PDB file of C-alpha atoms and ligand atoms in Angstrom:
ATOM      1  CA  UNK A  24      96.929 103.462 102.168  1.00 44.47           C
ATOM      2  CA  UNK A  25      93.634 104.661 104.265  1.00 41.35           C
ATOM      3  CA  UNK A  26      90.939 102.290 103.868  1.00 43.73           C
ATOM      4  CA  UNK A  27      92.313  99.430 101.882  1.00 37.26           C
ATOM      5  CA  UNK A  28      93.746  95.762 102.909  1.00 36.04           C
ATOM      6  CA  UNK A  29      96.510  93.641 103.193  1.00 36.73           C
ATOM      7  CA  UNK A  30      97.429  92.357 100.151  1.00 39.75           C
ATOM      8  CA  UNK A  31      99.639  89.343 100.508  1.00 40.50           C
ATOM      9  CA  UNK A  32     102.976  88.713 100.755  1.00 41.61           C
ATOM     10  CA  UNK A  33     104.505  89.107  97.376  1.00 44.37           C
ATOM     11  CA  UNK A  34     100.532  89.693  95.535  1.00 42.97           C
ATOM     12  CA  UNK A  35     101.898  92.982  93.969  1.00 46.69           C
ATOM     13  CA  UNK A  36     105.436  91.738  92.374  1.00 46.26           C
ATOM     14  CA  UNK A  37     106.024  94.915  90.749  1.00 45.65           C
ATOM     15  CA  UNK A  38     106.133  97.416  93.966  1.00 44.21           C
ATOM     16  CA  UNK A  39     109.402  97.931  95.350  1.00 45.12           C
ATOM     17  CA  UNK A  40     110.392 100.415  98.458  1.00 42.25           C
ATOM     18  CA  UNK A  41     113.260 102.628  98.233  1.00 42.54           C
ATOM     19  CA  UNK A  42     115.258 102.679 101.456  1.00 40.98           C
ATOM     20  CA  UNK A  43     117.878 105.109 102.587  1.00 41.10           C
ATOM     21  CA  UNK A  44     118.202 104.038 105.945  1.00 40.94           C
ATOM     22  CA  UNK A  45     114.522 103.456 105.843  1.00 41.39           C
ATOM     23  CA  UNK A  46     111.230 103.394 103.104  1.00 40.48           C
ATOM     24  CA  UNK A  47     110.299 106.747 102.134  1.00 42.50           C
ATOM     25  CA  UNK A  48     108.929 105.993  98.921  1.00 45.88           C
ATOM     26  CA  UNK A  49     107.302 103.350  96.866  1.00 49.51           C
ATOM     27  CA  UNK A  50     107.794 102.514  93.141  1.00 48.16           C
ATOM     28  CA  UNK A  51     106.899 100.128  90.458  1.00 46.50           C
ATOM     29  CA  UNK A  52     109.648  97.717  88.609  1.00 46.98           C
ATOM     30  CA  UNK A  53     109.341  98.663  84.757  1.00 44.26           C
ATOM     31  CA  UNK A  54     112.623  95.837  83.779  1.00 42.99           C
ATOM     32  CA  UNK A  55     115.182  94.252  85.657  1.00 40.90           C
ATOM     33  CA  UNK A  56     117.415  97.231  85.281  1.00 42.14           C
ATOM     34  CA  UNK A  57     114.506 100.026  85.991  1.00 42.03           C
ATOM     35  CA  UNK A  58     112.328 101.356  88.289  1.00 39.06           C
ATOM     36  CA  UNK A  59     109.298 104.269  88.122  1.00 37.53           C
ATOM     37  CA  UNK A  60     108.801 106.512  90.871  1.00 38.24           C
ATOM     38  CA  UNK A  61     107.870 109.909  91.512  1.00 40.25           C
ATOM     39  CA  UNK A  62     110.230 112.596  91.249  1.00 42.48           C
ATOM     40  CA  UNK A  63     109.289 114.319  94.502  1.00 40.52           C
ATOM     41  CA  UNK A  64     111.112 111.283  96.615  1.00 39.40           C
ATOM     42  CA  UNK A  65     114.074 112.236  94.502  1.00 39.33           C
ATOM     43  CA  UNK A  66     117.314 111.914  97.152  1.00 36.59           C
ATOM     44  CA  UNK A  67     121.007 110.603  96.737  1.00 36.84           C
ATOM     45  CA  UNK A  68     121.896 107.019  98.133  1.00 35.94           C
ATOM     46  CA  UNK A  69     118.810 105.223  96.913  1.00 33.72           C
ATOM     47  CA  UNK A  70     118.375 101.435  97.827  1.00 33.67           C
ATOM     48  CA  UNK A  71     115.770  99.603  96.025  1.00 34.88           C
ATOM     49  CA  UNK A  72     114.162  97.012  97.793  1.00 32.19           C
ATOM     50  CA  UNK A  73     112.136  94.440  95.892  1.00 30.62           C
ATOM     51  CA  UNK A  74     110.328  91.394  96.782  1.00 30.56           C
ATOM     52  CA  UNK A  75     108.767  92.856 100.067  1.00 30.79           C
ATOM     53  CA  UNK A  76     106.115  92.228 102.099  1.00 28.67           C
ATOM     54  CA  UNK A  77     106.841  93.085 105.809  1.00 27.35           C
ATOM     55  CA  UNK A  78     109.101  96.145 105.382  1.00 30.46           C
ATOM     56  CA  UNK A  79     110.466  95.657 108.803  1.00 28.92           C
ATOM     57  CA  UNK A  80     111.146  91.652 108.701  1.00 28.95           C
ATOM     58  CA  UNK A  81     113.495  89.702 106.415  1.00 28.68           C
ATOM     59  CA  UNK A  82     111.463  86.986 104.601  1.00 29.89           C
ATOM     60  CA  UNK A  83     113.526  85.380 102.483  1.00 28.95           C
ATOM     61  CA  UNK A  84     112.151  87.099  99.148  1.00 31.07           C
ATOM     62  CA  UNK A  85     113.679  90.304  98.955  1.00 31.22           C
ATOM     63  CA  UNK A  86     116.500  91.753  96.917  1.00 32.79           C
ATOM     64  CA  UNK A  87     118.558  95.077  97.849  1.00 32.69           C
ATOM     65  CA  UNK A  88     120.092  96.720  95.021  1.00 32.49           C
ATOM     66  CA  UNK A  89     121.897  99.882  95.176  1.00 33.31           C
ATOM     67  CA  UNK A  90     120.365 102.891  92.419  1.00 31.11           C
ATOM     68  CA  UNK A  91     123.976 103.314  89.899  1.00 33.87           C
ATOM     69  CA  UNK A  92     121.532 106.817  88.552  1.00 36.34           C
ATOM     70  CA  UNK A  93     118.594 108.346  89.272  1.00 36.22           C
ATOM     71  CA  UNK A  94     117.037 110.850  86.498  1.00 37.95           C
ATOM     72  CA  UNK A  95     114.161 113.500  87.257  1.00 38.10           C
ATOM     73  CA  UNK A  96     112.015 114.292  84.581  1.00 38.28           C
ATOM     74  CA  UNK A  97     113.233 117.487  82.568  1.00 35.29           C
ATOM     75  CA  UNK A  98     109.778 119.605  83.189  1.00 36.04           C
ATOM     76  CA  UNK A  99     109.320 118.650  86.877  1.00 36.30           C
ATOM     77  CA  UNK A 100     107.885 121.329  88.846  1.00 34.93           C
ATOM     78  CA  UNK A 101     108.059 121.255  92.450  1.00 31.98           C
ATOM     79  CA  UNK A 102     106.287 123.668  93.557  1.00 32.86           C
ATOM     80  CA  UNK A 103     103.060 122.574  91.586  1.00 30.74           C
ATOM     81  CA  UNK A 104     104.105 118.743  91.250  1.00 32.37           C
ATOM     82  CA  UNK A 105     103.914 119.301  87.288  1.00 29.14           C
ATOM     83  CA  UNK A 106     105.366 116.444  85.950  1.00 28.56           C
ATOM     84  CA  UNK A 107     106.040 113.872  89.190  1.00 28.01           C
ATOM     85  CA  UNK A 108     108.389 111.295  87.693  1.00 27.02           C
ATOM     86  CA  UNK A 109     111.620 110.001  87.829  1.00 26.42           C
ATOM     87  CA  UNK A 110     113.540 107.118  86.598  1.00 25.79           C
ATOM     88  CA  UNK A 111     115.681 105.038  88.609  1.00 25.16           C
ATOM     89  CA  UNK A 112     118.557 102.421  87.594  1.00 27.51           C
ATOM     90  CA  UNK A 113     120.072  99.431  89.628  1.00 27.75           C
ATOM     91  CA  UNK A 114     123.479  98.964  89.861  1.00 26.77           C
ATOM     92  CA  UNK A 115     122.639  95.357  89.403  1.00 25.79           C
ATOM     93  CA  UNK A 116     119.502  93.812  87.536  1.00 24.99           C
ATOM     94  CA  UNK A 117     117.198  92.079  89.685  1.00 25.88           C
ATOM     95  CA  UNK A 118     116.404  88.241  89.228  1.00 27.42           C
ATOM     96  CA  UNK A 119     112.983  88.191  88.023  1.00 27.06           C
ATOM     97  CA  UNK A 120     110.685  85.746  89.709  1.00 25.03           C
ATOM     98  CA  UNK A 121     107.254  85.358  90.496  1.00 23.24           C
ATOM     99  CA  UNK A 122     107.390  87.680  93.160  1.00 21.77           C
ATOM    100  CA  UNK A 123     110.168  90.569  91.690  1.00 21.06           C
ATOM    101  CA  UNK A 124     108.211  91.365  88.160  1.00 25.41           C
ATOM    102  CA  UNK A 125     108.027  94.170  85.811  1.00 27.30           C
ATOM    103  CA  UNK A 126     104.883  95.690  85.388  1.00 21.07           C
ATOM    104  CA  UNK A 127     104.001  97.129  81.658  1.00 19.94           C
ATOM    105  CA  UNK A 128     103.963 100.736  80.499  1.00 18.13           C
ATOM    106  CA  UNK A 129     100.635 101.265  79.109  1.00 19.37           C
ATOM    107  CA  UNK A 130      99.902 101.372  75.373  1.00 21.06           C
ATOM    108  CA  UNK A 131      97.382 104.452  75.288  1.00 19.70           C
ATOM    109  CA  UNK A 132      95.942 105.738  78.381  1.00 19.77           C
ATOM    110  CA  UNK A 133      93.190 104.920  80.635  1.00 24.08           C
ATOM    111  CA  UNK A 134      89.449 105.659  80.523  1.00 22.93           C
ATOM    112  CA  UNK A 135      87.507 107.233  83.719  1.00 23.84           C
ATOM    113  CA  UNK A 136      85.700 104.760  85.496  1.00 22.37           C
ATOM    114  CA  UNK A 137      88.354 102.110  84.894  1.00 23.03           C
ATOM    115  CA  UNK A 138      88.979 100.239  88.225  1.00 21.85           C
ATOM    116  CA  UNK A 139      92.911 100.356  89.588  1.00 26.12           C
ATOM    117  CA  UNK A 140      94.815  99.106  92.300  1.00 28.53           C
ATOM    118  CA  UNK A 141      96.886 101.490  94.585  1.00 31.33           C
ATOM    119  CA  UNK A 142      99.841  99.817  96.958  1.00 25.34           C
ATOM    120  CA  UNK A 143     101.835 101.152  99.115  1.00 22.89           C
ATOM    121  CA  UNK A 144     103.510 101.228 102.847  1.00 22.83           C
ATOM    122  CA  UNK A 145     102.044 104.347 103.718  1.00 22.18           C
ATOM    123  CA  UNK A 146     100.139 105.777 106.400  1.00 22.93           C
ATOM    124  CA  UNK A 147      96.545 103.899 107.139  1.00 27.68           C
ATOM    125  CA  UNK A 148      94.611 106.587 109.345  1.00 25.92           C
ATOM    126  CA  UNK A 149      93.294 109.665 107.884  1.00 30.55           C
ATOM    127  CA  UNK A 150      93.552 111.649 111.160  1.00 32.40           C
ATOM    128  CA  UNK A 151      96.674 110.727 112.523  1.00 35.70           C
ATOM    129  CA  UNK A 152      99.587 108.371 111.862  1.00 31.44           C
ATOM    130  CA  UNK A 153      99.882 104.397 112.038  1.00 30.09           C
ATOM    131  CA  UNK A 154     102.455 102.633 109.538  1.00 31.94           C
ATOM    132  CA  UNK A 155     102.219  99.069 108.790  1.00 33.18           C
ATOM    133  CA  UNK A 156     104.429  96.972 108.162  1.00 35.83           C
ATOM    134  CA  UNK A 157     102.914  94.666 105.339  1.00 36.15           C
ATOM    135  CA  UNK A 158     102.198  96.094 102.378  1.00 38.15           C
ATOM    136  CA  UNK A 159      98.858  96.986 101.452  1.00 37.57           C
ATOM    137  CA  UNK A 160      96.104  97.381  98.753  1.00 37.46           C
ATOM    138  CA  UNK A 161      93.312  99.430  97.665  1.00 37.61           C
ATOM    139  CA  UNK A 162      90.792  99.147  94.603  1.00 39.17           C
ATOM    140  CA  UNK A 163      89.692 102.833  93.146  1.00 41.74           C
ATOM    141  CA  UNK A 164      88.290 103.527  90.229  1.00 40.90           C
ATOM    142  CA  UNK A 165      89.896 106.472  87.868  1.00 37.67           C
ATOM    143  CA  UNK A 166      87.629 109.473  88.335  1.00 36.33           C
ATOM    144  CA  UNK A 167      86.499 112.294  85.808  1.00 36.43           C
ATOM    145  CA  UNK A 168      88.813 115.066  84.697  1.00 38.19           C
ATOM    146  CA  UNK A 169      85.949 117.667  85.633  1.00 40.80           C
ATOM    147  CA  UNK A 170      85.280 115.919  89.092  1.00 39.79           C
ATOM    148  CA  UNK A 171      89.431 116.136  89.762  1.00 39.40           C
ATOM    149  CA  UNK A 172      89.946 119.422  88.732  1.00 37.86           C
ATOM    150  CA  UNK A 173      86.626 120.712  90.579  1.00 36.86           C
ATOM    151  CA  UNK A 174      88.393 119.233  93.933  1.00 33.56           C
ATOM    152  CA  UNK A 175      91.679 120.966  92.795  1.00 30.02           C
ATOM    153  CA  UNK A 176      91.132 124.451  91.252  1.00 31.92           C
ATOM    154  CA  UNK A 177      93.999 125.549  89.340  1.00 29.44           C
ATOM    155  CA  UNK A 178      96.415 122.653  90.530  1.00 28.72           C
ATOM    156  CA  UNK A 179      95.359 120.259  87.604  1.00 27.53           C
ATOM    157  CA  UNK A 180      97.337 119.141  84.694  1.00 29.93           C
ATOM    158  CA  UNK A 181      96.994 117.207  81.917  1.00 29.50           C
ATOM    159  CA  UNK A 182      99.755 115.586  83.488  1.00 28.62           C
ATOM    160  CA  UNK A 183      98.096 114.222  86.533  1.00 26.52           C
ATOM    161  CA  UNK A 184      94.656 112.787  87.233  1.00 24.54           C
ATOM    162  CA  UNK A 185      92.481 111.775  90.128  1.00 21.16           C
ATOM    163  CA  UNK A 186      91.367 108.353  91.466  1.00 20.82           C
ATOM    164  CA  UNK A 187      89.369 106.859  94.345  1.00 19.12           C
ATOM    165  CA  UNK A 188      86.399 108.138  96.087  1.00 20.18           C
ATOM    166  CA  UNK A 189      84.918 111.456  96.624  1.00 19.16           C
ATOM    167  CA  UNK A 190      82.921 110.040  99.486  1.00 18.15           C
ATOM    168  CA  UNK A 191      86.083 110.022 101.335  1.00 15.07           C
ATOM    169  CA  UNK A 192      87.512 107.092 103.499  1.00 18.98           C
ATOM    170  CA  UNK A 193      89.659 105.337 101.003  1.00 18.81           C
ATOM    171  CA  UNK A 194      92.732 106.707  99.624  1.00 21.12           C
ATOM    172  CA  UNK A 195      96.663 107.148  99.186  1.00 25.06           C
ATOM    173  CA  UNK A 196      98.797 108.532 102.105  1.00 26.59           C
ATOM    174  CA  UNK A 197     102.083 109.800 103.237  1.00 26.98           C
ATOM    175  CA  UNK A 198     104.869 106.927 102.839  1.00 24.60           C
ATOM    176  CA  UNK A 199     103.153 105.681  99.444  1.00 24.20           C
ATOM    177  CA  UNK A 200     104.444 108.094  97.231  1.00 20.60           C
ATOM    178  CA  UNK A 201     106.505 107.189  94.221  1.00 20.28           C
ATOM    179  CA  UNK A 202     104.089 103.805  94.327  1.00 21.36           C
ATOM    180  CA  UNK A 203     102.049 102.105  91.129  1.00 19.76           C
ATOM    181  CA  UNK A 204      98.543 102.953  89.744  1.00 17.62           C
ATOM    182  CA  UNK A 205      97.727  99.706  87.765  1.00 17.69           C
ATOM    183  CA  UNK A 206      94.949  99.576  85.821  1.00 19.29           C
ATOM    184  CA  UNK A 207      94.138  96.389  83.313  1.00 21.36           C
ATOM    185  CA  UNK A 208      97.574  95.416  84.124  1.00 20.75           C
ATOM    186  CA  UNK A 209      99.537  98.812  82.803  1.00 20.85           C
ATOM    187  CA  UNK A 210     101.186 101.098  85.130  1.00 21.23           C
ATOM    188  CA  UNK A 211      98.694 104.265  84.392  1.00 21.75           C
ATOM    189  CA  UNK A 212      99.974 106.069  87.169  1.00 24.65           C
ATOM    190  CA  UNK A 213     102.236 106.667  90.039  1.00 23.39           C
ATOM    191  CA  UNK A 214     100.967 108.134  93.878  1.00 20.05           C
ATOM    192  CA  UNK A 215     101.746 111.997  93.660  1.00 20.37           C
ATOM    193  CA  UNK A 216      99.849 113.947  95.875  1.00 22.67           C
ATOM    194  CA  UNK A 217      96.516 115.222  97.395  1.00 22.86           C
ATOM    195  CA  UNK A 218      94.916 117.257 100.524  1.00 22.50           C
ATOM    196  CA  UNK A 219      94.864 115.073 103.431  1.00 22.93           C
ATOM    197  CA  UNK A 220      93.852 111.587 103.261  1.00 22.73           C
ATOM    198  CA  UNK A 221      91.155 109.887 102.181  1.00 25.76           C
ATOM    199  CA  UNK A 222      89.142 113.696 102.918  1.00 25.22           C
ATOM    200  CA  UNK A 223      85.765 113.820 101.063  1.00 21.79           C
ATOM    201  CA  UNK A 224      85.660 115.826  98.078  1.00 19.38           C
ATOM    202  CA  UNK A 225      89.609 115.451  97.888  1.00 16.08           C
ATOM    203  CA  UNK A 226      90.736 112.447  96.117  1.00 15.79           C
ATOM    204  CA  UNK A 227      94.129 111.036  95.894  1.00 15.59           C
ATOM    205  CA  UNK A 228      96.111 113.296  92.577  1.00 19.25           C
ATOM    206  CA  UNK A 229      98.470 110.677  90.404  1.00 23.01           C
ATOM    207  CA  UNK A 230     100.889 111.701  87.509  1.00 21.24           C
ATOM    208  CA  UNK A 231      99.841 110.493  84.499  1.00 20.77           C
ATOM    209  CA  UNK A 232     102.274 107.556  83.321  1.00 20.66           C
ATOM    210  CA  UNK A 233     100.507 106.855  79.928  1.00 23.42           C
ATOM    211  CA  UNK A 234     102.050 110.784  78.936  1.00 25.32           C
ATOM    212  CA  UNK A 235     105.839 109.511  79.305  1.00 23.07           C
ATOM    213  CA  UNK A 236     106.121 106.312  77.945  1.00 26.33           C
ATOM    214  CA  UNK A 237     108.096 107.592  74.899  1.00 27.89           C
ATOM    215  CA  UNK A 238     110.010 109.852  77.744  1.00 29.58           C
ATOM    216  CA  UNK A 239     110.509 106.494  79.636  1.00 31.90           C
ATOM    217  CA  UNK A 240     111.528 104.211  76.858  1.00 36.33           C
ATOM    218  CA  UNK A 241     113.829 106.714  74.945  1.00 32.95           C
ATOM    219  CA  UNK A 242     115.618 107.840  78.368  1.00 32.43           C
ATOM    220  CA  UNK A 243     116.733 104.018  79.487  1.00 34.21           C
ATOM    221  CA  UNK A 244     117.522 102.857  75.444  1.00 35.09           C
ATOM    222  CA  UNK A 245     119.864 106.112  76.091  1.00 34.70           C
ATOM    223  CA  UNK A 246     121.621 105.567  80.135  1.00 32.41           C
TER     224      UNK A 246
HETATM  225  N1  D86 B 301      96.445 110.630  97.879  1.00 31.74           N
HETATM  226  C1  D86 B 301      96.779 111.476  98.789  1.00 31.74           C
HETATM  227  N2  D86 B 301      95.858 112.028  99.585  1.00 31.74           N
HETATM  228  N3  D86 B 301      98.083 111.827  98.969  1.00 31.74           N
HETATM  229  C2  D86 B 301      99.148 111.326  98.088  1.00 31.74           C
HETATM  230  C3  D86 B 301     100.308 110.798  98.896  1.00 31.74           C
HETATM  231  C4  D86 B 301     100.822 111.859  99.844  1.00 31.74           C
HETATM  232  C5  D86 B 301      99.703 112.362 100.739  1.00 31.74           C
HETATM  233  C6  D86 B 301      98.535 112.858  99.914  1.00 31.74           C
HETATM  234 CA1   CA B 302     111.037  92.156 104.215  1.00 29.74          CA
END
């Protein structure tokens, strides 16, 4: 996250880190048995990790649960990021508590304008590299669908849309991928992609969560 803060320890309940050997990837607890992420940080040998705050340091909040199934959306496109979900299932469900908590699926999607908050460990300079260890936090509203796909020409879905700042200076990064768009307290969107970081005139690109929730619900009532 480029130009946002530190949330608190344990502030955004519903973020987890997947670790294989490391975090490479955010995502967003959906139950105790499922977790939302994107499908380009789609690997084998998955470890959820929820209950963080300092990636790096064991507080005494966390819980490490192996993925039993990981399951890529059917229409994911990699080379244009069509379609940037995937569904992942612990071996064990998690004990929810105040700090490991589901986050709702929305009910109909989200207006431009509407103000969301974007987490994630990811990069925090937007020339250069410096990973923190705490997790962190950025408000941004949704933007239009003409100002998104003006940035983006040709690379636009219906699938995906655009939020932040066209100013520049605030933004998503590498390392928060796979990580939660909330918005009035529904996951609208996951942390896809974009050009650079927090670049003016090239906000942050997110898929568009409120498009699968009958993909979502069906696929876990069915694995
Ligand atoms: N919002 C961005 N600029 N991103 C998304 C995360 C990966 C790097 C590009
Ligand atoms: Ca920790």
């Amino acid at each position: 996250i480029v130009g946002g803060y530190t949330c608190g320890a344990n502030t955004v309940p519903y973020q987890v880190s997947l670790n294989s050997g490391y975090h490479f990837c955010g995502g967003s607890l959906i139950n105790s048995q499922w977790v939302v992420s994107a499908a380009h940080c789609y690997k084998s040998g998955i470890q959820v990790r929820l209950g963080e705050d300092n990636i790096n340091v064991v507080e005494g909040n966390e819980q490490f649960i192996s993925a039993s199934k990981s399951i890529v959306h059917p229409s994911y496109n990699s080379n244009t990021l069509n379609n940037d979900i995937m569904l992942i299932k612990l071996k064990s469900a998690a004990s929810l508590n105040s700090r490991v908590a589901s986050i709702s699926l929305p009910t109909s999607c989200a207006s431009a304008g509407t103000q969301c908050l974007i987490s994630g460990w990811g990069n925090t300079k937007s020339s250069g590299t410096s990973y923190p260890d705490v997790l962190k936090c950025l408000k941004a509203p949704i933007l239009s669908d003409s100002s998104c796909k003006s940035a983006y020409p040709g690379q636009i879905t219906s699938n995906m849309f655009c939020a932040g700042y066209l100013e520049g200076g605030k933004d998503s990064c590498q390392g928060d991928s796979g990580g939660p768009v909330v918005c009035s307290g529904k996951l609208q969107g996951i942390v896809s992609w974009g050009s650079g970081c927090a670049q003016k005139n090239k906000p942050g690109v997110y898929t568009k969560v409120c498009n699968y929730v009958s993909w979502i619900k069906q696929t876990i009532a069915s694995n």
